[PDB]
Every structure is written in structure tokens, then in C-alpha cells.
Design a protein around this ligand. Structure first.
Ligand SMILES: OC[C@H]1O[C@@H]2O[C@H]3[C@H](O)[C@@H](O)[C@@H](O[C@H]4[C@H](O)[C@@H](O)[C@@H](O[C@H]5[C@H](O)[C@@H](O)[C@@H](O[C@H]6[C@H](O)[C@@H](O)[C@@H](O[C@H]7[C@H](O)[C@@H](O)[C@@H](O[C@H]8[C@H](O)[C@@H](O)[C@@H](O[C@H]1[C@H](O)[C@H]2O)O[C@@H]8CO)O[C@@H]7CO)O[C@@H]6CO)O[C@@H]5CO)O[C@@H]4CO)O[C@@H]3CO
Ligand code: ZN
Length: 106
């Protein structure tokens, strides 16, 4: 994925080897204090009231743009799909892959 044009948060890429779920995320540097979480459905596509979460952390700047990189990695029992949540300055933004969410393979 290329840098987003206006979205506040947008997955860049993700990886899954059947045990470890990891990835890189584009985050618009709106304010200093940020919270970026990855919310997923389990091997049984159960969301658990948005309770299966992975906290992402600052990874590094992106020269010449108003975005920066955040990464995440975690072992998960199983996963069917996921979306990203971004909280900053009292507002909440999301990356739900045009409301289809990101579907994971195997
Ligand atoms: O005393 C320092 C500081 O202490 C407290 O802040 C803590 C905070 O409460 C915790 O949440 C945590 O902060 C984490 C943060 O929430 C995460 O989002 C992430 O932050 C990364 C950013 O996402 C990323 O963008 C980058 O940050 C760069 C900024 O975007 C860029 O603007 C610039 O920052 C400058 C500030 O804009 C400017 O105001 C000035 O900052 C000073 C503050 O004004 C002053 O209040 C104080 O800050 C307190 C804070 O209020 C407490 O709550 O001192 C600041 C001086 O350092 O100057 C900044 C220039 O340095 O540049 C930064 C890059 O440096 O990277 C960050 C970090 O990777 O992760 C955060 C850390 O986990 O922890 C902090 C304490 O470390
Ligand atoms: Zn990309």
C-alpha cells in the first residue's frame, strides 16, 4: 500500500504464518498521544465484543509526509478477519477495508 491520501489510519501490510500475526500500519501524525489497536475475529470468526486486541506501537517516521509507521506482532489462537482502530485527540478513526474488514487466509 502507498501512503493514504486522507484516511487517518490505514494498514500498510500484514503477515500471518498460522501462529504469529504481525503488520505495519500507516498513521497520520495528528497529535503526540496516540492509541492504535488491531481488533480481530477468532479462528471461529467470533469478535468477542471487540475484545480480541493487539496494541500497536510507534515504529518510525516517514520522511516528507504527515504519516508515520506503527507496527504490531502477537501470537493468536486463530484469526479470520480484522480491522484497525486509531484514537487521538478525543476522536476515533478506523481502517475496516471498505467495511469488508481484512480477510486472512488459513
Ligand atoms: O516529558 C516528556 C513527555 O512525558 C509525557 O508523555 C508520555 C505520554 O504521556 C505517554 O503516552 C508516552 O507517549 C507515547 C505516545 O502517546 C505515543 O503516541 C508514541 O508517541 C510517538 C509519536 O506517535 C510519534 O509521532 C513521535 O513523536 C514525535 C511528535 O509527533 C512530534 O510532534 C515531535 O514532538 C514534539 C512535541 O510536539 C512538542 O510538543 C514537544 O514535546 C514536549 C511536550 O510539549 C511536553 O509536554 C513534554 O511532553 C511530556 C508529555 O506531556 C507527558 O504526557 O515534553 C516534550 C518534549 O519531549 O517536543 C517534541 C519534540 O521532541 O517529535 C516527536 C518525536 O520525539 O514519537 C513518539 C514517541 O516515539 O509513543 C510515546 C512513547 O511511548 O510516553 C511519554 C513519555 O515518554
Ligand atoms: Zn505498502
Amino acid at each position: 500500500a502507498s501512503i493514504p491520501s486522507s484516511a487517518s489510519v490505514q494498514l500498510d501490510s500484514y503477515n500471518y504464518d498460522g501462529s504469529t500475526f504481525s503488520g505495519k500500519i500507516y498513521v497520520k501524525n495528528i497529535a503526540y498521544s496516540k492509541k492504535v489497536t488491531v481488533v480481530y475475529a477468532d479462528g471461529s470468526d467470533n469478535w468477542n465484543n471487540n475484545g480480541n486486541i493487539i496494541a500497536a506501537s510507534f515504529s518510525g517516521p516517514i520522511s516528507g509526509s504527515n504519516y508515520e509507521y506503527w507496527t504490531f506482532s502477537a501470537s493468536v489462537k486463530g484469526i479470520k478477519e480484522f480491522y484497525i482502530k486509531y484514537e487521538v485527540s478525543g476522536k476515533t478513526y478506523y481502517d475496516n477495508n471498505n467495511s469488508a474488514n481484512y480477510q486472512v487466509s488459513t
